[PDB]
Design a protein around this ligand. Structure first.
Ligand code: CLA
Ligand code: CLA
Ligand code: CLA
Ligand code: CLA
Ligand code: CLA
Ligand code: CLA
Ligand code: CLA
Ligand code: CLA
Ligand SMILES: CCCCCCCCCCCCCCCC(=O)OC[C@H](COP(=O)(O)OC[C@@H](O)CO)OC(=O)CCCCCCCCCCCCCCC
Ligand SMILES: CC1=C(/C=C/C(C)=C/C=C/C(C)=C/C=C/C=C(C)/C=C/C=C(C)/C=C/C2=C(C)CCCC2(C)C)C(C)(C)CCC1
Ligand code: SF4
Ligand code: SF4
Lengths: 60, 33, 161, 40, 30, 733, 81, 80, 75, 75
């Protein structure tokens, strides 16, 4: 929704499913997955951020 | 009776497996059907 | 009584085992001069064996056909001494431990260096938490009825849930 | 500061605490040996 | 005490069954 | 076409030796065959089942023929306690003269194997007495197998192939396979027992030539129709009855004596007849439950849809399970395998305790062999049931058709199931191993009085409840002033109590701390195997590591070293891992059974009660002690009849070790070695003429794990079979 | 026949039972339970069962107890509506 | 040959293409991503199945996926 | 492992032993290596099974620690 | 550091020989006396591991050949 806002993940395949992550950047220039989110826990690959579509995030 | 095992055991343990393996080897690598 | 077990107080096999242990220790000590350090050690072993067997006889344990004590663990109060009483102690101690641990996890977890505080323990805070475990059952029940014990369904899961 | 912080590391504290637990367990078994069951 | 005739007829019935097995397998048709 | 495996174009085009290997391992997976439809799948399964029945009946006919032609069945039935049953002759040109002289036993005049199948006792019990009867049975079975093979061929013809709707006619199938396959079959078997087995046991020869004129009972169906069925229970065989002769014989054909026949120490034939009559009646009544174009009956889809508790704790209840079960062959295959495994375990548990066959329970080797055999088969069947359930989840589950279903809710809270199973497994393992090591340590320090010996109060209480007046519980049938005993006192209680309280039996063996610890070890094994299999089945459709696992199928090697490494991540790998635990737990069970029975047979059961509380006792008093007659099968001084079993013992050890070769060392090393081997072959004169047609490559990862597991299992089974047979037959215990 | 709510549709009871009013099923269930319990008690509880004490009537009555349970469930289902 | 699929979650960082040892993958112009590029697998006959591309993927779950299938001389990593 | 088994059995059966005042030699295992070390069953029986008596029977003596370690190493 | 560890190990071995061993008794009668330089505290009944090696001494029999080495050095 906005920079720095916490969002609950809804991507079923995501390692951070049902977890809270902070939005880093949002691309207003179209794009299918514009909302970059960062989570505290690192996934199995060691990364802690991913791009999601606004439909795949619960706002708060 | 008392003569058959001599006749059959060699056939079942040597001749039968030999021919069976020959035919299976032919068919596995036939390259057609 | 219980399952055809005769109390170890009147168990001939129990006394035979005691005699066998004592006599074998005596045979072992017969090859040392009286008063030698090995002789004193073996005599102390004999005394300890006698005390152990006497304590088992006086305790009220049930012997089998083999002469060894058997434990009744069906909840019988007369035999609680065998399993119920120690078990409670365990569930207390471990409980304490567990509770304390959980608290530490939930105390240092609200920091940026939460990971760094697990390899390196904050000994002052750690002891602060550890000293509070003697009331772990009450605190656990209070958290349970207060909803602060369990996390909501909104937590990590897998594709098929 | 640094030395005490090192003493606070996980392996050092685990070793110290396990040594302490083994010690008091050993002493308890030394003063009350062969404790199969609780005194009346 | 099975006589040679009994063994022979058992072998004949086994041969018939073997031929039927051959045909059934062939019909499973790989 | 175009190569060996037609059913796989991808494998057909494979230029390596892999094409051959997988061509063998994908043959029976009809679902994956190219150009395969549902109807052809079902018809091929039907024909394959016909073929399998033919194989079973030919195996049985072979057993009968070999016993008749080379056995000593007549000598055995004359004196069934002292002579040893014969399996078949040994025509081995590799034998030396001392071997021929050593393996000549029983009837003699040829080398021979002593049968441990117990088929002699079974055939004797069911009424057979002469080699002619065995031969006739074998000829009948050969004809039956030929008929089944012909039927299998016939039902593949275009005009005889049953339609797809026919296979999925669940109601009629259940009706017929309940009332007909189970009930009418049981009715026929009790008819046999009444007409043949019982008269043969009472010295009267009934056969095809005279069974139509000698009624099994003198009154002859007059009491049956008149309602005076009590007539058939009057005048049973008195305790002083010599089995197989009219000495002390009776006339009853349907009684409820209970207990055992004193002379044979087995069940009364009349009791078996009455049992099977009642079972046949119950099954025939049960088979009229579902409707089949006759108006009356139940429709199972409605039943399944209707059972959804209004409390909502089961969600949508059983809605949609009918479609999943009928449309999925893997789910019903798993259900059948599981039920068969439970029944195989039940047969193993009940045959030893309740001897059904005359003069068995004195042929110790046969009893041990049968128990071990059926327990291992039960373990295999259970593992297969769970494996096929995982397969069903992979390729047959439809999450949209099972929304909020009971089965879907199984996956919804899979984490809880797996975590609590893991907790139970850890609890049992930790504490059982701790108690065993505690006993080992205290006994090692010469202080056996400090052992933690826990009395199995609950099992002993159950034994007392059935009438075991040895633990002094005075409960239920063990106390006279109880409704249960008085109510049952008239019918079967006397014989049952006489059997249970007699210590010359396997009915409710006396138990102690050793039995307690071993039972908890068995519980650990079952729980851990179930944990592995259930985790595989539930995570088959995806995990956090592989959220799209279902897309890779049931059996794939891995998903690469990425994100931490994913070796053995597929459900097939869960089955492969669980096979080891199944073998381990079945081994524990069989070790427990064999050692307890060996100690009882030797006449010193105290040895087990003493030495089963610590592991060194198991290693010394059971394995080290009882293997002496086995490893001495052949020594530099000579050889004896057990030499074959010793050789098989070493062979099983070798195969078991060879399995480690495939289980430890993985493919890359072997592929790099085969590279050099290929180079060497290609660069050799006089051998460049001969060139492979299939490129030689190392075994695939999944294939290698399978082959290692197969070697492990074969070696395990062979070595334990050799041990259990040889020790028992060498010490007669 | 999948049903939600607190009471299943009457069609679950089958063509015949579904048409029976609740009081009739209740009385039938009480009669069946009484007869079945009385039969099960007369033989094997109040009197020991022997070879020559097998009464077909008592066997039928004993079988009637599951019928009593089914009829009481059906009566409740009919009662809810 | 193995089947290599690229999903629209890709962020076009090129890492999968770089990691590929058999030059199966490449970059093609695209508009659904910020970088304007997406990975493609035009020539999967040369894919060996090492799954290096998946290992070198930033996206939460493997915008590039490899599914092993029929094996040929090329995909079997055989110099013979 | 094979090297150590070879050394142990050979020394126990062919070198180590006792002598009498006359000079007679009595080895630990009676020289059973020549006719029993030529089969796998011979190694299994006369070396492992036969010489494992001490460990399995060491309970209740000063060597009981060796039996405990035997079991622990197996575990 | 490794050399320091090895020297500490040697120091421990020699000290346990001097204070906790029957080296003198073995010296007097090497054939009968069994070498031993380790003693176990009696805490759980593990004192059974204190074998009757000889020389009015009880301890765990050692097999490191340290006694023979020391004798060769004329200790
Ligand atoms: C009365 C009619 C009837 C009968 C006798 C059968 C019988 C059979 N059917 Mg058929 N079937 C029927 C009606 C019938 N069916 C109908 C109406 C349909 C249409 C829906 C089908 C559709 C159908 C299909 C599609 C298939 C069969 C199959 C089978 C076979 C199952 C395998 C087997 O050997 O059974 C096992 C028989 C037993 C008696 C074992 C009972 C199981 C218990 C657990 C064993 C316990 C026994 C005992 C206690 C152990 C001691 C014995 C020991 C001493 C030897 C069996 C021959 C299958 C087959 O193999 O085809 C050839 C198959 O694929 N049937
Ligand atoms: C599956 C059942 C079975 C089994 C395991 C055996 C096993 C044996 N038989 Mg017997 N046999 C059987 C059934 C069986 N028989 C039947 C039904 C008959 C009646 C014809 C005979 C008649 C018979 C004779 C006359 C002799 C043997 C002999 C032998 C032995 C040597 C093998 C041989 O020469 O075969 C010879 C067997 C045949 C020529 C007939 C084939 C046997 C069965 C029917 C084949 C079953 C195949 C099975 C379903 C699996 C097929 C798959 C396979 C191709 C991989 C061996 C112990 C010999 C012996 O005693 O040596 C000591 C011997 O002389 N058998
Ligand atoms: C304080 C930490 C803590 C707490 C509260 C729990 C609590 C629990 N664990 Mg976990 N666990 C822990 C640490 C902890 N565990 C560690 C460190 C490991 C790795 C060895 C595991 C491995 C583990 C497994 C594999 C399983 C559990 C399970 C369980 C549950 C049942 C109890 C049990 O089986 O314990 C088992 C405990 C162990 C096997 C090892 C515990 C080791 C020590 C005693 C705990 C750590 C103490 C630590 C020093 C805290 C210091 C605090 C200080 C700094 C102030 C329960 C929810 C089971 C479950 O899911 O049940 C549903 C289960 O299957 N646990
Ligand atoms: C997990 C299984 C298990 C269990 C239940 C036990 C339980 C026990 N063992 Mg066994 N043991 C085990 C595993 C186990 N051990 C293993 C794996 C080994 C090998 C390493 C041993 C080796 C062993 C020996 C050699 C001996 C025992 C002894 C004991 C007893 C301890 C008495 C004691 O310390 O005083 C009680 C001590 C305390 C209560 C101290 C704690 C004080 C708390 C903190 C007070 C807090 C207030 C509330 C007890 C019955 C000893 C004994 O006497 O048995 C009869 C003994 O001689 N065990
Ligand atoms: C219960 C056993 C069983 C059954 C019923 C089947 C059934 C089937 N298999 Mg499977 N299979 C089995 C065991 C079995 N298989 C085993 C153990 C293996 C090895 C792992 C395989 C490997 C395998 C492959 C690789 C393939 C099959 C295929 C088939 C199908 C037809 C094959 C056929 O008969 O063609 C015709 C074959 C014959 C007519 C030969 C019959 C053998 C005769 C009876 C031997 C008689 C010799 C006799 C003993 C000689 C004695 C002489 C003596 C006097 C010396 C059918 C679905 C094929 C299929 O359908 O795939 C979809 C296929 O491609 N199977
Ligand atoms: C009647 C029951 C039944 C039926 C119809 C099936 C049918 C099937 N199973 Mg299931 N299964 C069963 C029982 C059954 N299985 C049991 C009991 C287990 C537990 C072990 C399994 C475990 C299992 C697994 C884990 C898998 C299957 C799979 C399959 C499918 C392919 C099978 C195949 O290609 O065979 C190929 C046949 C072979 C490779 C032959 C191997 C025979 C054994 C292992 C070797 C024996 C060696 C011999 C004893 C050595 C002689 C000893 C001598 C040297 C001394 C097929 C639909 C596979 C699948 O994907 O299905 C979709 C699969 O992954 N099954
Ligand atoms: C003797 C061999 C052995 C042993 C002891 C285990 C033990 C275990 N396995 Mg493993 N396993 C084995 C062989 C073995 N396995 C083999 C050959 C296979 C086939 C590949 C498997 C496959 C397998 C799978 C697939 C699974 C297991 C599981 C388990 C657990 C079962 C529950 C249990 O007993 O918890 C109790 C734990 C034990 C008995 C382990 C020993 C613990 C000791 C006593 C503690 C010692 C602590 C001590 C201070 C160490 C100090 C070290 C220091 C000196 C350096 C446990 C960890 C299951 C599991 O994880 O359940 C949660 C599981 O899912 N195993
Ligand atoms: C280097 C080889 C070596 C070995 C293997 C041993 C082994 C042994 N010695 Mg010997 N000893 C050695 C060297 C060695 N010693 C040397 C060099 C000396 C000369 C000083 C001695 C002098 C000596 C005496 C005088 C005695 C022994 C005794 C013993 C036994 C009991 C030791 C014990 O647990 O006491 C208890 C020891 C402890 C509880 C250790 C303390 C625990 C610390 C505080 C843990 C700290 C770890 C720390 C957290 C790690 C991080 C570093 C931190 C400092 C920053 C044991 C068999 C005793 C014996 O045999 O009795 C009959 C005995 O009386 N030893
Ligand atoms: C030991 C089990 C081993 C096998 C594995 C489990 C398989 C079977 C699972 C069901 C077990 C029996 C559950 C009894 C469940 C039971 O009897 O209650 C059933 C009840 C739900 O019943 P219904 O939803 O059908 O009832 C509708 C209500 O409106 C009452 O009419 O649940 C509860 O009362 C609260 C939760 C249970 C609290 C029980 C306290 C005692
Ligand atoms: C994977 C899977 C699967 C499978 C599963 C399984 C395999 C399961 C198993 C299960 C089982 C395996 C179970 C068992 C059971 C058992 C039981 C359930 C028993 C019971 C019993 C009872 C209940 C009781 C009895 C009695 C009586 C009568 C009374 C008294 C006591 C006695 C005991 C006598 C399927 C396919 C589905 C699909 C999905 C997934
Ligand atoms: S590595 Fe992944 S994110 Fe990067 S270009 Fe390749 S597919 Fe896209
Ligand atoms: S699996 Fe390997 S060869 Fe295939 S596309 Fe990925 S990196 Fe390239």
């Amino acid at each position: 929704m906005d920079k720095g806002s916490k969002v609950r993940n809804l991507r079923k395949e995501s390692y951070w499913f049902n977890e809270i992550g902070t939005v880093v950047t949002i691309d207003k220039s179209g794009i299918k997955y514009p909302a970059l989110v960062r989570f505290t826990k690192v996934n199995y690959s060691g990364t802690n951020s991913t791009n999601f579509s606004l439909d795949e995030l619960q706002e708060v | 009776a008392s003569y058959l095992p001599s006749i059959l055991v060699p056939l079942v343990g040597i001749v039968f497996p030999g021919v069976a393996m020959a035919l299976l080897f032919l068919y596995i690598e036939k390259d057609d059907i | 009584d219980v399952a055809g077990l005769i109390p170890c107080n009147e168990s001939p096999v129990f006394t035979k085992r005691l005699n066998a242990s004592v006599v074998k220790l005596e045979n072992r000590v017969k090859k040392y001069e009286a008063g030698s350090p090995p002789a004193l050690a073996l005599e102390q072993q004999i005394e300890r064996t006698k005390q152990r067997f006497d304590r088992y006889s006086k305790s009220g344990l049930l012997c089998g056909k083999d002469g060894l004590p058997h434990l009744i663990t069906d909840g019988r109060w007369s035999h609680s001494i065998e399993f119920v009483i120690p078990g409670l102690m365990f569930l207390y101690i471990t409980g304490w431990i567990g509770w304390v641990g959980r608290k530490y996890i939930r105390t240092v977890g609200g920091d940026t260096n939460a990971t760094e505080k697990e390899i390196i323990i904050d000994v002052p805070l750690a002891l602060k938490i550890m000293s509070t475990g003697f009331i772990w059952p009450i605190s656990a029940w209070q958290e349970y009825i207060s909803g602060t014990l369990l996390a909501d369904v909104s937590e990590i899961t897998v594709s098929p849930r | 500061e640094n030395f005490l912080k090192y003493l606070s590391t996980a392996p050092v504290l685990l070793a110290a605490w396990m040594t302490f637990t083994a010690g008091f367990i050993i002493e308890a078994n030394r003063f009350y040996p062969d404790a199969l069951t609780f005194p009346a | 005490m099975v006589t040679d005739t009994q063994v022979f007829i058992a072998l004949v019935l086994a041969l018939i069954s073997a031929l039927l097995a051959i045909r059934l397998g062939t019909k499973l048709y790989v | 076409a175009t190569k060996f495996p037609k059913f796989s174009q991808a494998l057909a085009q494979d230029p390596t030796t892999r094409r051959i290997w997988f061509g063998i391992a994908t043959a029976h997976d009809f679902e994956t065959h190219d150009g395969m439809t549902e109807e052809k799948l079902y018809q091929k399964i039907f024909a394959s089942h016909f073929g399998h029945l033919a194989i079973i009946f030919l195996w049985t006919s072979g057993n009968l023929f070999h016993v008749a032609w080379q056995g000593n069945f007549e000598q055995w039935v004359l004196n069934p306690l002292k002579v040893k049953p014969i399996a078949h002759t040994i025509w081995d040109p590799h034998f030396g003269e001392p071997a021929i002289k050593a393996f000549t036993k029983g009837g003699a005049f040829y080398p021979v194997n002593i049968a441990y199948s117990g088929v002699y006792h079974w055939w004797y019990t069911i009424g057979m007495r002469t080699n002619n009867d065995l031969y006739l049975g074998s000829i009948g079975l050969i004809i039956l197998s030929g008929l089944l093979l012909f039927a299998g061929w016939l039902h593949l013809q275009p005009k005889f192939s049953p339609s797809l709707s026919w296979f999925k006619n669940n109601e009629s199938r259940l009706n017929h396979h309940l009332s007909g396959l189970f009930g009418v079959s049981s009715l026929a078997w009790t008819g046999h027992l009444v007409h043949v087995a019982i008269p043969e046991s009472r010295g009267t020869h009934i056969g095809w030539d005279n069974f139509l004129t000698t009624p099994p009972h003198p009154d002859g169906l007059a009491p049956f129709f008149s309602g005076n069925w009590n007539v058939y229970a009057q005048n049973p065989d008195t305790a002083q009855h010599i089995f197989g002769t009219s000495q002390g014989s009776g006339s009853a054909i349907l009684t409820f004596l209970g207990g055992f026949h004193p002379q044979t120490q087995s069940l009364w034939l009349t009791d078996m007849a009455h049992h099977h009559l009642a079972i046949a009646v119950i099954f025939i009544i049960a088979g009229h439950m579902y409707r089949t174009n006759f108006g009356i009956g139940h429709n199972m889809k409605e039943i399944l849809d209707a059972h959804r508790p209004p409390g909502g704790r089961l969600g949508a209840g059983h809605r949609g399970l009918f479609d999943t079960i009928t449309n999925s062959l893997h789910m019903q295959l798993g259900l059948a395998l599981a039920s068969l495994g439970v029944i195989t375990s039940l047969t193993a548990q009940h045959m030893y305790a309740i001897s059904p066959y005359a003069f068995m329970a004195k042929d110790f080797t046969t009893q041990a062999a049968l128990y071990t055999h059926h327990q291992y088969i039960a373990g295999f069947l259970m593992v297969g049931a769970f494996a096929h359930g995982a397969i069903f989840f992979v390729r047959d589950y439809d999450p949209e058709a099972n929304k909020n279903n009971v089965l879907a809710r199984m996956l919804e809270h899979k984490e809880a199931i797996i975590s609590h199973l893991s907790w139970v497994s850890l609890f049992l393992g930790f504490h059982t191993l701790g108690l065993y090591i505690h006993n080992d340590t205290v006994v090692a320090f010469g202080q056996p009085e400090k052992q933690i010996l826990v009395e199995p109060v609950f099992a002993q209480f159950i034994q007392a409840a059935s009438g075991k007046a040895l633990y002094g519980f005075d409960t239920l049938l063990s106390s006279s002033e109880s409704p249960a005993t008085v109510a049952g006192s008239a019918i079967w209680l006397p014989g049952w109590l006489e059997a249970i309280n007699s210590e010359k039996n396997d009915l409710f063996l006396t138990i102690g701390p050793g039995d307690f610890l071993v039972h908890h070890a068995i519980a650990l094994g079952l729980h851990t195997t179930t944990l592995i299999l259930v985790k595989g089945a539930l995570d088959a459709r995806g995990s956090k590591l592989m959220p799209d696992k279902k897309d890779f199928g049931y059996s794939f090697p891995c998903d690469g070293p990425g994100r931490g490494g994913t070796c053995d991540i597929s459900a097939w790998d869960a089955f492969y891992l669980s096979m080891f635990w199944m073998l381990n737990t079945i081994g524990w069970v069989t070790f427990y059974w064999h050692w307890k029975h060996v100690t009882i047979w030797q006449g010193n059961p105290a040895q087990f009660n003493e030495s089963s509380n610590y592991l060194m006792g198991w290693l010394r008093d059971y394995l080290w002690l009882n293997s002496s007659p086995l490893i001495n099968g052949y020594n530099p001084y000579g050889m004896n009849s057990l030499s074959v079993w010793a050789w098989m013992f070493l062979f099983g050890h070798l195969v078991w070790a060879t399995g480690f070769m495939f289980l430890i060392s993985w493919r890359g090393y072997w592929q790099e070695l085969i590279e050099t081997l290929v180079w060497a072959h290609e660069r050799t004169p006089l051998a460049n003429l001969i060139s492979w047609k299939d490129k030689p490559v190392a075994l695939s990862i999944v294939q290698a794990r399978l082959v290692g597991l197969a070697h492990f299992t074969v070696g395990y089974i062979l070595t334990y079979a050799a041990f259990v047979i040889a020790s028992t037959a060498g010490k007669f215990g | 026949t999948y049903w939600e709510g607190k009471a299943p549709p009457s069609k679950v009871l089958g063509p015949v039972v579904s048409q029976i009013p609740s009081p009739a099923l209740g009385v039938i269930s009480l009669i069946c339970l009484g007869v079945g319990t009385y039969s099960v008690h007369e033989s094997n509880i109040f009197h020991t069962l022997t070879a020559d004490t097998i009464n077909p009537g008592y066997i039928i009555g004993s079988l009637l107890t599951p019928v009593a349970w089914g009829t009481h469930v059906a009566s409740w289902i009919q009662k809810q509506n | 040959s193995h089947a290599v699929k690229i999903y629209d979650t890709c962020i076009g960082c090129t890492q999968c293409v770089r990691a590929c040892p058999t030059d199966v993958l490449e970059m093609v112009p695209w508009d659904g991503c910020k970088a304007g590029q997406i990975a493609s697998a035009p020539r999967t006959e040369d894919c060996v199945g090492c799954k290096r591309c998946e290992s070198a993927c930033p996206t939460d779950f493997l915008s590039v996926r490899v599914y092993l299938g029929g094996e040929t001389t090329r995909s079997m990593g055989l110099a013979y | 492992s094979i090297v150590l088994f070879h050394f142990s059995w050979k020394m126990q059966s062919d070198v180590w032993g006792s002598v009498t005042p006359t000079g007679a030699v009595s080895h630990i295992t009676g020289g059973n290596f020549a006719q029993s070390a030529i089969t796998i069953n011979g190694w299994l029986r006369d070396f492992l099974w036969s010489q494992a008596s001490q460990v399995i029977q060491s309970y209740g003596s000063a060597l009981s620690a060796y039996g405990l370690i035997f079991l622990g190493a197996h575990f | 550091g490794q050399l320091a560890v090895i020297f500490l190990w040697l120091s421990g071995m020699h000290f346990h020989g001097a204070y906790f061993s029957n080296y003198l008794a073995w010296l007097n009668n090497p054939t009968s006396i069994k070498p031993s330089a380790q003693v176990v505290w009696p805490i759980v009944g593990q004192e059974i591991l204190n074998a009757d090696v000889g020389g009015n001494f009880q301890g765990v029999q050692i097999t490191s050949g340290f006694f023979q080495l020391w004798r060769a050095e004329g200790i």
